[PDB]
Design a protein around this ligand. Structure first.
Ligand SMILES: Nc1ncnc2c1ncn2[C@@H]1O[C@H](COP(=O)(O)OP(=O)(O)O)[C@@H](O)[C@H]1O
Ligand SMILES: [Cl-]
Length: 369
C-alpha cells in the first residue's frame, strides 16, 4: 500500500486522538474547507513562513473531519500527508522515486475523491526534484485533490506555471500575535508538562511569547515560543535528575577538607576530621530527604500521565456520542485525578530540593543565549 508506505494518515491519527490540540485558526480552517468543496481550483495551498502553523491548520481540519464537523462533501474524507523522506529512502536508481510517487497518485485517484493528499514543502515536489508532470493530469481532470504548504517566495515560482495557478488556491497564513501565541501555549501546556514531568507557570508562557517575539526575530511565532518552553521544561527535568546544588556544595566542601588532610598541627587535623564527619552526616540526611521528595515527584508524574489519558478517553467518548462513558469519566475519575495532581504539586511547592515549575526566569536565561 503506497499511501501507508509513503504517507501518514492524519485522519487516522485524529480518530485515535493522537494529534495535539489546535487553538484558533478557525478562519483559516473554514477557508480550506470552503476551497476543497469547489468544483475548480479546489486545491488550497497554505503559504506562510516556517513555524507559523500551516501543518497545524491541516491537523485541525483532520480533527474536524473525524468529529464530523464538516459539510457533507467532506464527511468520511481522509487526509494523507506525503512523506518525502520515505519516498527517497533507498531509491538508488533513476525511476524508483518516480515509480513510488505514481503508485501514491494512482491510489489517491482510485479512492475517487475520498483521499486528499497533503503535501508539505510543496516546492520540493513541484518545481526544479521535479514531479509536476505526474500530478498535473490528475489535477486537470479533478480526480485528485491536494492541500499544499509552502513559503511565499517559493510559491512565486510555482505560480509562474500557468497550469498550476488555475488549480491551486493561495491561502496566506500570517504569524499569530503574542496574545494568540499565549493562547496557543496555554492550550499546549499540559502536553509539555506531561512529557517532561514538570509544571509550567503561566508567567513562563507569557515570557516565552513576549521575549521570543521581541528578541528572536529570525524565527516565527508560535514555533519559537513553544521551543523556549520545551527547552526550559527539558532542562528543568534534567536538573531534577541530577544532584541538587545544596547537597553538591557540602560534597565539594568535604573534598577540600579531604585534600587538606593529605597535607597535614594536630589541633588542625582533629578539627577537620570532625568537620568531614559532620558533612558526611549532613549529606546522609539531605539525601534521604531528597529521595522522599523524588518519590512525591514520581507519584505526581504518574498522576499526570493518568490525567492525560482520561482527557483523551473523554474526548473520544464525546466524539462517539457515548454519553454514559463521557459522564462516567467527567464526574468520577477526572476530578479525582485533577485533585491528586493539584495536591501533589502543592506538596512540592514547599520542597527543599525539587523545584517543580518552569519560571519566567528560566525563559529569560535561554533567551539571553
Ligand atoms: N493554532 C495552533 N494550535 C496549536 N499548535 C500550533 C498552532 N499553530 C502552530 N502550532 C504549533 O507550532 C509549531 C509550528 O507549527 P507548524 O504547523 O509545524 O508550522 P509550519 O507547518 O508552518 O512550519 C508546531 O509544534 C505546531 O504544533
Ligand atoms: Cl469555525
Amino acid at each position: 500500500n503506497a499511501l501507508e508506505q509513503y504517507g501518514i494518515d492524519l485522519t487516522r491519527l485524529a480518530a485515535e486522538g493522537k494529534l495535539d490540540p489546535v487553538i484558533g485558526r478557525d478562519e483559516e480552517i473554514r477557508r480550506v474547507i470552503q476551497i476543497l468543496l469547489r468544483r475548480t481550483k479546489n486545491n488550497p495551498v497554505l503559504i506562510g513562513e516556517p513555524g507559523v502553523g500551516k501543518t497545524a491548520i491541516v491537523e485541525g481540519l483532520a480533527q474536524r473531519i473525524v468529529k464530523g464537523d464538516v459539510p457533507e462533501g467532506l464527511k468520511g474524507k481522509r487526509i494523507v500527508s506525503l512523506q518525502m523522506g520515505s519516498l527517497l529512502a533507498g531509491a538508488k536508481y533513476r525511476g524508483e522515486f518516480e515509480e513510488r510517487l505514481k503508485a501514491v497518485i494512482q491510489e489517491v485517484v482510485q479512492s475517487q475523491g475520498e483521499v486528499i493528499l497533503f503535501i508539505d514543502e510543496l516546492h520540493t515536489v513541484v518545481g526544479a526534484v521535479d514531479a509536476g508532470n505526474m500530478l498535473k493530469p490528475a489535477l486537470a481532470r479533478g480526480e485528485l485533490r491536494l492541500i499544499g504548504a509552502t513559503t511565499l517566495d517559493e510559491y512565486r515560482e510555482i505560480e509562474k506555471d500557468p497550469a498550476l495557478e488555475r488549480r491551486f488556491q493561495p491561502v496566506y497564513v500570517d504569524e499569530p500575535t503574542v496574545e494568540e501565541t499565549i493562547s496557543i501555549l496555554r492550550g499546549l501546556k499540559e502536553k509539555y508538562e506531561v512529557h517532561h514531568g514538570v509544571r509550567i507557570s503561566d508567567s513562563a508562557i507569557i515570557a516565552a511569547a513576549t521575549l521570543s517575539h521581541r528578541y528572536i526575530t529570525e524565527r516565527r511565532l508560535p514555533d519559537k515560543a513553544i521551543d523556549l518552553i520545551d527547552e526550559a521544561a527539558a532542562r528543568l527535568r534534567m536538573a531534577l535528575e541530577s544532584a541538587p546544588e545544596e547537597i553538591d556544595a557540602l560534597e565539594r566542601k568535604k573534598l577540600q577538607l579531604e585534600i587538606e588532610r593529605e597535607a597535614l598541627s594536630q589541633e588542625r587535623l582533629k578539627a577537620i576530621e570532625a568537620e568531614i564527619a559532620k558533612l558526611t552526616e549532613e549529606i546522609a540526611k539531605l539525601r534521604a530527604e531528597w529521595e522522599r521528595e523524588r518519590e512525591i515527584l514520581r507519584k505526581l508524574r504518574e498522576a499526570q500521565h493518568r490525567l492525560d489519558e482520561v482527557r483523551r478517553e473523554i474526548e473520544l467518548a464525546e466524539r462517539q456520542y457515548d454519553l454514559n462513558r463521557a459522564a462516567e469519566l467527567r464526574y468520577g475519575e477526572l476530578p479525582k485525578l485533577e485533585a491528586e495532581v493539584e495536591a501533589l504539586s502543592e506538596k512540592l511547592r514547599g520542597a527543599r530540593f525539587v523545584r517543580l515549575e518552569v519560571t519566567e526566569e528560566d525563559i529569560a536565561e535561554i533567551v539571553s543565549r
